[PDB]
Amino acid sequence: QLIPPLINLLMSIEPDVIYAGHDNTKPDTSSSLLTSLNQLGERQLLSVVKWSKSLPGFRNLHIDDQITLIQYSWMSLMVFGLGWRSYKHVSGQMLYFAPDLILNEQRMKESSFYSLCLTMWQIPQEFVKLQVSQEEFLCMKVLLLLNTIPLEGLRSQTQFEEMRSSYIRELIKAIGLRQKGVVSSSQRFYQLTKLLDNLHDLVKQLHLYCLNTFIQSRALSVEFPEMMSEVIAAQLPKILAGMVKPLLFHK
Amino acid sequence: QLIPPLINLLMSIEPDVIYAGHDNTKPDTSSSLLTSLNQLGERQLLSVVKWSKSLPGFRNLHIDDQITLIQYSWMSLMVFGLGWRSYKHVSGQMLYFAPDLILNEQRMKESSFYSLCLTMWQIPQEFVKLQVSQEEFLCMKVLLLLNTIPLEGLRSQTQFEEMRSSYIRELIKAIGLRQKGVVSSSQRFYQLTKLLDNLHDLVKQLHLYCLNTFIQSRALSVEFPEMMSEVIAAQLPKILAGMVKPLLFHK
Ligand SMILES: Cn1c(C#N)ccc1-c1ccc2c(c1)C(C)(C)OC(=S)N2
Numbered sequence: 001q002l003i004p005p006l007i008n009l010l011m012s013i014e015p016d017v018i019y020a021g022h023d024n025t026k027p028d029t030s031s032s033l034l035t036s037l038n039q040l041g042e043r044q045l046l047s048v049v050k051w052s053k054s055l056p057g058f059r060n061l062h063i064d065d066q067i068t069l070i071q072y073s074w075m076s077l078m079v080f081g082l083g084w085r086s087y088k089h090v091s092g093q094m095l096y097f098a099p100d101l102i103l104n105e106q107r108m109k110e111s112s113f114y115s116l117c118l119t120m121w122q123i124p125q126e127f128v129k130l131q132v133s134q135e136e137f138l139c140m141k142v143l144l145l146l147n148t149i150p151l152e153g154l155r156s157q158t159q160f161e162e163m164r165s166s167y168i169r170e171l172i173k174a175i176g177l178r179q180k181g182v183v184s185s186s187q188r189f190y191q192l193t194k195l196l197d198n199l200h201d202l203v204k205q206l207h208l209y210c211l212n213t214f215i216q217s218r219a220l221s222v223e224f225p226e227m228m229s230e231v232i233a234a235q236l237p238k239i240l241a242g243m244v245k246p247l248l249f250h251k
Numbered sequence: 252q253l254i255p256p257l258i259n260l261l262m263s264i265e266p267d268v269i270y271a272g273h274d275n276t277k278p279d280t281s282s283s284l285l286t287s288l289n290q291l292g293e294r295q296l297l298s299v300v301k302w303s304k305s306l307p308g309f310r311n312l313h314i315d316d317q318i319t320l321i322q323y324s325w326m327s328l329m330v331f332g333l334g335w336r337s338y339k340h341v342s343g344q345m346l347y348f349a350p351d352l353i354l355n356e357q358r359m360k361e362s363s364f365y366s367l368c369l370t371m372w373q374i375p376q377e378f379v380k381l382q383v384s385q386e387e388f389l390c391m392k393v394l395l396l397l398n399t400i401p402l403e404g405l406r407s408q409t410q411f412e413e414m415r416s417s418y419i420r421e422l423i424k425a426i427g428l429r430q431k432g433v434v435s436s437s438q439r440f441y442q443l444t445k446l447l448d449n450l451h452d453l454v455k456q457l458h459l460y461c462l463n464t465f466i467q468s469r470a471l472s473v474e475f476p477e478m479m480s481e482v483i484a485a486q487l488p489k490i491l492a493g494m495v496k497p498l499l500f501h502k
């Protein structure tokens with residue numbers, strides 16, 4: 001009723017529940033956990049591709065641009081969605097990767113990658129502190145898809161600029177749904193966009209761990225499915241080397 | 252008598268000629284050329300480790316630090332040695348990888364590989380311009396070995412620093428063999444140490460190209476030998492991610 005139409009459209013095209021297909025009747029091993037995380041990843045990737053086809057504005061960018069944005073942003077979209085699920089289903093106090101892959105802190109501690117779990121866990125904790133709304137989350141998730149471009153820019157740079165600006169304007173409207181008053185709503189825009197800026201650094205730790213694990217995947221018995229392997233091979237070294245342009249809302 | 256004894260020692264421990272074992276017989280492909288450079292890189296890795304065992308001071312660092320410095324500097328030493336040979340044998344006008352692997356423009360077909368070679372070519376071009384002497388080159392090449400350290404520094408940090416100052420003093424002596432005046436001498440030291448600073452950015456492009464290729468090796472039909480492979484897997488992602496401290500002579 002009071003919800004802006006683009007936001008209702010964003011809510012309508014959100015994915016259904018995605019399962020990891022993890023055993024759970026067997027004790028965790030570093031290899032089985034990471035394999036399920038990658039299987040979950042492959043499924044989430046498929047879901048991003050489907051979502052992106054319905055995302056207003058996106059289909060009108062050159063196909064190369066679309067592929068590039070998905071390849072740059074997949075880890076940040078996954079970790080943001082994890083943040084949201086963990087916030088909404090478990091009050092932020094477990095990592096809700098999937099309904100069949102939920103790690104409470106004890107399961108994190110016994111994982112082999114406790115510190116990485118803790119890094120990821122920061123996000124749901126920030127959602128709790130900021131009380132991020134569904135409408136703000138939906139807009140912020142679009143901006144993450146649009147949050148890095150090549151050094152040379154995109155083929156459809158003009159159209160990207162219009163689309164990114166439109167979702168920023170939409171995030172502003174989502175904030176205005178609750179944050180009444182110029183000073184509160186102004187501060188809120190700072191905080192939410194600052195959070196997105198801060199994700200670049202958090203995602204860099206995930207990127208490095210993921211790349212090392214991919215390079216060592218045979219030794220470590222971690223499987224990487226096809227689309228996951230393709231995105232990692234295409235872009236992660238270049239992203240880690242800073243040979244792309246992360247977009248920031250603040251200096 | 253005129254040549255400082257340490258520089259004489261550096262001349263004497265310099266590696267013998269290294270062949271790539273390249274098949275000039277058959278026409279070259281991009282994959283077969285990259286394979287040959289990786290084979291040359293394997294052979295050069297062994298020569299670097301042998302060289303370092305006779306390099307005054309080096310064997311006195313903690314063994315972990317020795318391994319770290321070689322693994323950090325492998326690419327830079329290889330490209331610096333390439334600049335020296337191209338300068339010496341072909342007036343800087345071809346890339347003299349080995350006596351059986353010399354590339355000119357016509358042999359750099361793929362634009363990606365050609366751009367990479369243009370990057371490497373800057374070094375012999377500068378050697379030709381500055382008329383770098385063997386004595387300068389030999390001191391500079393030790394400082395390259397010593398030109399990046401871990402973020403937490405080395406185990407033998409004190410010894411490393413003394414060793415680095417020693418070779419900086421030896422470079423000054425090298426410059427004094429020819430650059431007679433105090434002003435000329437200081438400006439020459441600036442130029443040579445700026446060239447070393449500038450190698451970090453240059454080598455970063457080689458590191459990224461190398462990691463991408465390693466990641467896609469099976470698909471590109473490019474062979475990476477065992478020792479090279481370990482160096483790339485152990486350090487390149489971390490180096491590219493900026494998780495080391497490059498040392499700079501100038502701000
Ligand atoms: C699946 N997922 C979500 C979700 N949901 C958030 C982050 C990730 C995700 C997916 C795959 C990987 C990783 C995280 C990490 C553990 C860094 O390392 C490797 S090797 N693969």
Ligand SMILES: Cn1c(C#N)ccc1-c1ccc2c(c1)C(C)(C)OC(=S)N2
Pocket residue numbers: 285288289291292329330332333347348349367457458460461462464465
């Ligand atoms: C062998 N070598 C010299 C010499 N001499 C200088 C630089 C290199 C050297 C060695 C191996 C590789 C590379 C350069 C590049 C082309 C970057 O990419 C790949 S995939 N491997």
